[PDB]
Each structure stands twice: as C-alpha cells, then as structure tokens.
Design a protein around this ligand. Structure first.
Ligand SMILES: CCCCCCCCCCCO[C@@H]1O[C@H](CO)[C@@H](O[C@H]2O[C@H](CO)[C@@H](O)[C@H](O)[C@H]2O)[C@H](O)[C@H]1O
Lengths: 54, 95, 160, 92, 427
C-alpha cells in the first residue's frame, strides 16, 4: 500500500515538472511570430515598468 | 510648458500609430512622429536650460535620417517582389 | 502667444491624429509633412529658428520624400486592404496610447521651470561654435553613423 | 538676429501666393523599380543632412579657427567616403 | 586609442575593399579588431577621458569582450561580400562608443551605430532571416524612440544630457524608466525581450553569436551607467528570469532555446546592477561570452540557417573535444561548480543579497535550478547516438578556438583568483 503510495508521491513531483512544462510552453506561446503582437506586448510592458517606479 | 504636453500627446499618438498600423512603412511612419514629439520636447527644455537641447535635437534629426535610409532600404529589400506589405505576413518565427 | 499658439498646437495634434488615422499612405505621409511645416513654425516661435528651417528642409523636404518615393514605388494605400483586422486591438491600442499619454502628463505635472533663456533665435551663427566645439565628437560620430548607414542601405539592396 | 515681424510677413506672403494659386486653378476651371530612384533619393536625404551641418560652420567659421575647419573637414571627408562608396558601387 | 584603430580601419576598408579581394578584407578586419583589442590590453588601467568619450574599467572590459565577439564572428564567415565584414567593424566601433560614454545622445548615436548594421547582418537572405531583420528593425526603432524621449525627459528633469546629473523627482524617474526601456530591449530583458528568439532563430548563426555576446555586453556596460532604481531592477529581473527559463523548456530548436537562455541570463546579470558592482558583472560576462561564444561556434559548425536539438546528439563521437567543450559550456552556463559560470552567477547573486534584494534573489535561484533541465539536455545530448546530422568538422582555427576558450572556463572555475583580481580599475 505504502509502496504504491510512494510511487504516487514521485508521480506528483513529476506533476510539478509538468506544471513548469505547461507554464513554460504557455509563456513561449506568447510569441506568435506576429509583429503587431510584439508591439502590443512591448508598449504594454513599457507601461508596466513605468507604472512601477516613480 | 504648454508645448511639452503637446509633445507627450504626440508621442502617445505615434504609439497609437505603431499599435494600429497594419503595413510596415506606416508603422515606421508612426515611429517617426514619436521621434518628432521627442524633438519638440527637447526644444522646450532647451529653452528652459539653454540651447544645448537644440544641438541635441539636430543630431537627433540626423540620426533619424540615417535609420530612415536603412529602414526603408530594408522594407524595400524584403518586400520588392513579395506581395502586400502587411507586416503580419511574416509569422514564420514562433516562440 | 495663446492666440496663435492654440491654433498651432491644435493643428499639430490634428495633423498627428491624421497621420495615424488616414488609410491612404500618400495622404498620411502628406499630413505628416503638414505636421513638419507647422512644427518648424513652432520651432521658430520657440527661438529655435535654424532648427526650424532644417525641419522643413531635411525632415519635411527630404525624408518623407523618400517615404513617398518608396510607398509609390511599391504600392501605397492599396497595401492596407487585407482585412486581418484585429479590431479587439483598436480599443487596446487606443487605451495603451492613453496610458502612455497619462504617464507622461503625470511626470510633467508640478514642473515649475524658468523657460526664460536668452537662447538668441536658434541661428547657426550661435549654433556653430558649439557644434564644431563642445559637440565635435558627437558630430563626427554622427558622420560615421551616416557613412555606415549608407553602406548598410546600399548593401541592403544590391541586386544581381 | 532678425525682427520677428518678418517671419509673420513670410507667412502672409505665403497666404497671398496660395490665394493666387487657387485663383489660377479656378482659371483652370475656365524589378529594379525602386533601386535607382531610391538610391538617388536617399543620397538627397543625406546631402541635405550634410549641408544642414555645413551651414552652421559656414557662418561662424573664421571664429572657429583651424580646429573648427579641421572638424568640418573631417566631417565632410567621412560623408564623402560614403558617397564615394555608393559611387564606386555604381548607381543604375 | 582603440577608437582610433576602429575608425581608421572602418573608413579605410570601406573604399579599400573596392581594391581588395573579400578575403583580404577579412584579413584586414581581423587584424584591425585584433589591434583594437591589443591596444586595450596595453592600456589596461589607463583611464583615458576625452570629450563625452571616456575609457575606464567598464569600457575596457566590455569592449574587450565585444571585440572578442567581433573577432570570433568574423572568423567563421568566409562568404565573400566585403560589407559582411565591414558592417561588423561598424557595429564593433558602435558598441565601443556605447560602452564608452555617459552622454545620452552620443549613446543614442552609438546604439544606432551598432544596431543599424545588425539589421543588415540578419540577412543570409533567408525568408526567415528577412523576417528577423524586419522584426528586429521595427521593434528596435520603437525602442529607439522610447530611449530618445527618455533622453529628452532626462534633459527635462535636469539641465544635462549626461548621466551622473543629480536628478529630480518624478520627471527624473520617468526619464530613467524611458531609458531602461530602450537599453533593456537592447540587452533582451523582459518584458522587452520578444525580438530575441525570432531574431536568434532567424539570423545566420555566426551573426547570432556576434549578437548574443558582443551586443549584450555593450548593452550591460551602458546599463551600469544608468542609475537603475531597485523597483524597476526587480521587475526586469523577475520577469526575465522566469520567462527566460520557463519558456526555454518548451523549445525544440537549439538557437531559440539559447535565445530564451540569454533572456534568463540577462535577468541574472541585472542583479549585479543592484549595487552596480561592475567587477561582478564584468566577470559574469567574461564567463558568459566565453561559454556562449563557444556554444554558438559549435552550433555554427552544424548549420547556419537553423539547428534542431537532435543535431547536437552524437557530437562527441564526431569530435571528442567539441563534445567536451560543448558540455563544459552547458555546465558553465548552468552555473555549476567548479566552473567560471558558477563564479559569475555567484558574484551577481552576491550583489543582490548585499543590496538586500532577497525575494528577487531567491526567485532567481529557484528558476536557475529549473534551468538545469535544458542546459543538461544539450551537454549530455553530446553523448547520445547520432541522428543523421550535418557536420563540417571545422578548421584548426575553430577547433582550437572552441577548445581553448573552453579550457579557459574551468581554468577560471578553479582559479578565478587569476582574472578577478583586476576586472576592476586595472590594478
Ligand atoms: C570615422 C569614425 C568616427 C568616430 C568618432 C571620432 C570623433 C573624434 C573627434 C573628437 C573631437 O571632439 C571634441 O573633443 C574635445 C576634447 O576631446 C571636447 O572638448 C571637451 O573635452 C575637454 C576635455 O575633457 C574639455 O576640456 C573641454 O572643456 C570640453 O569642451 C569636445 O567636446 C568634443 O566634442
């Protein structure tokens, strides 16, 4: 029982792995290849950094 | 002072241009307007701080020209035989 | 002051609005030349005179002429047709533009400056000694930039 | 240098000229495509720049002495290395 | 003067290349870059201040690295169009200027000076290369605009266009942010990083080497000169680190994964900015330029246009020393002892913690541990069974290059007390 349980624990850690995988290919999916998108995300970003400082 | 605010408004307008414009040359144009907003601000502040900002703005104009040469050169080069200049036609490189 | 100024700045903002709005590349660029004209006006009014004349000559006269030659030598105003619109973007572009406006307005508020300088109407007689002087390094560097720029642009075309 | 009045005068002059233009109009009522014409247009937008720098020198020049002259000389020679390039490259 | 060598060689070679064969011009640009570099080594600890131009420790180290990138990138590009070396000289000088002033406007001129010829170098004329050039150029010019408006606002909030000017309240901050936009873009910090993957994947590989090393170097040199505030610094860091490694996980192509890797690495480097130590940053970038330069030379010997990760596999059998040097590079980029990369990362982290930026620091460390996924997925992949993969086994040039530069890595992993004593003022 506890053996297979432990197998499930390791499995869950792998689950975290896949969580980082998922989030990762989500952040890489942000780059469509479309330049207008890049400009939008850019201006947005600038607004963000500017919003943080003063 | 009254001018400085117009400079900021213009820069904003240019940003709107870049974000809105569908074709390469016109995005580039909106950028040129932004540059000019910057220049105007440089003139106002030169009038506050004493004339160095004018030389600054002139250098700026020169630079702008250089990057217009290279930028249009590029636009023409890439889209010469190629069809419509809409910048989203190149989406091959994806993240 | 304010009498002319209101009309001038309104015409400025209007011109810019056009250059970012018009769907005809020729018309747009043209509106931008109107902008540069009025801008050289404002420079003159701002004791930057030589800069104003260079504004007409280089920016209005030359640069947007290259733009026009190019949009005419490919195709202008008929390039935007495609209809891959992204109109969910238009209010987002508009909003982000308003944001980038608001932030600058904020940073510019509460600024009490002496705009009273003796900057004797931007004449090149007063501009020169600075340029070939304290600015000579930046000047020359700019020159080099222009050289490299032309070599790039030519090599960036070069058929065969 | 100049009284500000004469810029206003310039503008007025422009006004008259334009009005007359309108008048005359109303009497009218009575591959490789870019390359050459691009290159020799771009070089215009570069020489305009060059001259835009040469003018401030040409006025205050003797005041700037041999080192000022040396500066304008260096500048000119750089840009002319550029032009000599696109000339020796050929434009046709 | 280094600037003298660069200027002379550039202007001369422009017209001399009409009377010289392309190969002879390569010999030329090589010699010139080398001479600039040598002039640098001979004046180590000179500080030579002219006008806005100023050669101190920062200019020295960062233009040393940038010149090293120019040297290596020129080495690999036999392809005859003398401009495809000339432009590299142009860019090189420009990067030097960029690292050599606090003058905002000269800085702008230098930025255009280096980034204008690069838009051109993104052209192996590949349809993807053209896309890269276009993206790089548009996003670049916009960033330029922001940096210029920042300079005008800096001149707004203070009478100068020189960094080091005392600095006001709000307008000063807004100015610094608007500068950090353009400068950050140029160093591939988030959220100004979008161009990097497309450009690295799209551009011809040796060109990409030149970019990911020299450009980043000069960019950070110029970032040291800015008074970068803690808040903005934190933002840039956290975003760059996270997006860097996490997005790097999803990458199935080599160059693009390395671009994302460079985004995360910019993130780590920015930590040094917290104190603006510059001794740390210098070291870090020494290790980085070495290992990255190596990696991209190796990735050049496979394919210039694009490389899938499978191509890396079996590299050891083919060339043992390139396999080993590539592994070593991957480990030094991981920051795993006893390699110089670990010392660089440690030296940046050290400044982060010294500055008291703990949450940011820890975050960086966690996702840095994450990064061990992909750095190993390459270095180890060296030993896998070879898929049918393109390989031009290099000249003595490149083999001895990758090997020597590689040996340097663990050489400084064991003995950082060699180079670290003076990456400072030069004593
Ligand atoms: C082709 C390649 C082109 C690359 C760029 C090469 C340019 C080199 C030309 C240098 C001349 O540029 C000019 O030099 C002098 C001294 O150095 C500067 O003078 C300035 O620096 C000195 C020394 O700190 C100060 O005494 C002086 O008060 C100040 O005005 C001047 O501001 C600058 O504008």
């Amino acid at each position: 029982a506890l053996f297979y349980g432990d197998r499930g624990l390791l499995s869950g850690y792998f689950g975290l792995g896949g969580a980082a995988r998922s989030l990762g290919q989500g952040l890489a999916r942000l780059q469509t290849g479309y330049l207008r998108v890049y400009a939008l995300l850019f201006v947005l970003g600038a607004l963000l950094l500017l919003g943080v400082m003063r | 002072m009254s001018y400085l605010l117009t400079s900021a408004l213009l820069f904003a307008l240019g940003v709107y241009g870049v974000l809105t414009r569908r074709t390469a040359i016109l995005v580039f144009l909106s950028i040129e307007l932004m540059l000019n907003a910057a220049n105007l601000s440089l003139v106002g502040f030169a009038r506050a701080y004493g004339l160095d900002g004018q030389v600054a703005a002139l250098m700026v104009i020169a630079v702008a020209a250089a990057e217009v040469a290279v930028g249009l050169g590029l636009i023409v080069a890439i889209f010469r035989h190629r069809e419509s200049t809409a910048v989203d036609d190149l989406s091959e490189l994806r993240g | 002051m304010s009498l002319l100024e209101g009309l001038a700045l309104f015409l400025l903002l209007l011109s810019g609005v056009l250059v970012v709005t018009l769907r005809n590349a020729i018309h747009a660029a043209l509106a931008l030349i109107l902008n540069f004209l009025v801008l050289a006006g404002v420079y003159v009014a701002l004791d930057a005179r030589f800069l104003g004349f260079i504004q007409v000559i280089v920016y209005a006269g030359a640069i947007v002429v290259l733009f026009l030659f190019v949009i005419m030598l490919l195709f202008a105003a008929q390039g935007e047709i495609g209809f891959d619109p992204l109109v969910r973007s238009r209010p987002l572009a508009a909003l982000l533009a308003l944001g980038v406006a608001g932030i600058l307005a904020a940073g510019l508020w509460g600024l009490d400056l002496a705009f009273t300088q003796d900057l004797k109407g931007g004449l090149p007689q007063a501009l020169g000694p600075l340029l070939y002087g304290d600015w000579l390094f930046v000047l020359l560097a700019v020159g080099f930039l222009l050289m490299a720029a032309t070599v790039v642009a030519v090599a960036l075309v070069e058929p065969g | 240098m100049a009284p500000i009045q004469e810029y206003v005068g310039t503008l007025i002059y422009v006004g008259v000229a334009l009005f007359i233009g309108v008048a005359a109009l109303l009497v009218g009522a009575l591959k490789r495509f870019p390359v050459h014409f691009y290159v020799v247009a771009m070089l215009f937008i570069l020489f305009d720049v060059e001259v835009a720098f040469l003018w401030p020198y040409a006025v205050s020049a003797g005041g700037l002495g041999l080192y000022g002259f040396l500066g304008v000389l260096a500048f000119t020679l750089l840009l002319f290395v550029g032009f000599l390039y696109e000339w020796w490259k050929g434009v046709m | 003067m280094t600037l003298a060598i660069l200027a002379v060689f550039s202007v001369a070679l422009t017209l001399l290349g009409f009377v010289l064969p392309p190969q002879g011009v390569k010999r030329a640009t090589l010699l010139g870059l080398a001479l600039a570099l040598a002039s640098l080594l001979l004046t180590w600890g000179k500080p030579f201040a002219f006008g806005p131009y100023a050669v101190d420790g920062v200019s020295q180290v960062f233009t040393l690295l940038a010149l090293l990138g120019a040297l290596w990138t020129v080495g690999l590009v036999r392809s005859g169009r003398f401009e495809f070396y000339l432009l590299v000289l142009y860019a090189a000088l420009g990067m030097h200027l960029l690292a050599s002033t606090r003058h905002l406007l000269l800085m702008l001129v230098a930025l255009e000076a280096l980034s204008l010829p690069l838009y051109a170098l993104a052209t192996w004329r590949r349809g993807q290369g053209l896309e890269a050039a276009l993206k790089y150029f548009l996003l670049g010019a916009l960033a330029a605009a922001f940096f210029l408006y920042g300079a005008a606002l800096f001149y707004g909030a203070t009478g100068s266009l020189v960094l080091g000017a005392p600095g006001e309240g709000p307008l000063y901050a807004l100015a610094l942010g608007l500068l950090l936009v353009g400068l950050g873009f140029k160093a591939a910090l988030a959220p100004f990083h979008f161009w990097t993957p497309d450009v690295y994947q799209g551009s011809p590989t040796p060109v990409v080497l030149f970019m990911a090393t020299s450009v980043k170097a000069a960019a950070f040199a110029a970032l040291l000169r800015v008074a970068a505030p803690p808040e903005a610094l934190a933002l840039l860091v956290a975003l760059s680190v996270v997006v860097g490694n996490l997005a790097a996980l999803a990458q199935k192509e080599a160059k693009r994964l390395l671009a994302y890797s460079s985004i995360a690495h910019a993130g780590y480097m920015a930590l040094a900015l917290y104190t603006g130590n510059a001794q740390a940053l210098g070291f870090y970038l020494l290790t980085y330029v070495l290992a990255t330069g190596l990696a991209f030379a190796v990735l050049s010997q496979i394919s210039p246009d694009r490389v899938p990760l499978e191509a890396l596999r079996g590299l050891y059998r083919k060339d043992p020393l390139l396999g080993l040097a590539f592994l070593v590079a991957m480990l030094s980029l991981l920051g795993l002892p006893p390699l110089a990369g670990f010392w660089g990362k440690y030296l940046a982290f050290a400044e982060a913690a010294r500055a008291g930026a703990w949450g940011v620091l820890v975050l960086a460390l966690v996702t840095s541990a994450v990064s061990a996924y992909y750095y190993l997925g390459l270095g180890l992949a060296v030993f896998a069974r070879p898929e049918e993969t393109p390989f031009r086994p290099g000249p003595p040039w490149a083999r001895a290059a990758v090997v020597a530069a590689g040996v340097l890595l663990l050489a400084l992993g064991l003995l950082p007390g060699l180079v670290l004593p003076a990456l400072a003022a030069g004593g």
